[PDB]
Design a protein around this nucleic acid. Structure first.
Length: 95
DNA sequence: ACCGGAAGTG
DNA sequence: CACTTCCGGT
């Protein structure tokens, strides 16, 4: 019963996943080094074996409207977590 | 690579 | 709600 942003926060945390997903170090900026593996892993997690990066990125793109995160434009596969009071309350509650 | 729209699924 | 699917479009 995991949300995508929560699933990524978990993978991102340990450096055992440094080869496919990691923090840029420029704040909450994070890049999906190997997007199809991040996609593969999200798929096994939700038992959606059809998961690829085009589907996973739509769900990340839905996070733009939620205020939780936004694209780090100009840097391929790099996204960032929005650090504002609206996003803190969006992440400290679910339906 | 990256962006929605729109329908559909738990 | 929170995605998933699956396009069309730039």
């Amino acid at each position: 019963s995991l949300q995508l942003w929560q699933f990524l926060v978990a993978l991102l945390d340990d450096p055992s996943n440094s080869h496919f997903i990691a923090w840029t170090g420029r704040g909450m900026e994070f890049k999906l080094i190997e997007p199809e593996e991040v996609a593969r892993r999200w798929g096994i997690q939700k038992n959606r074996p059809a998961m690829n990066y085009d589907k996973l990125s739509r769900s990340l793109r839905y996070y733009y409207e939620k205020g939780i995160m936004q694209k780090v434009a100009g840097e391929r596969y790099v996204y960032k977590f929005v650090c504002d009071p609206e996003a803190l309350f969006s992440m400290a509650f679910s339906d």
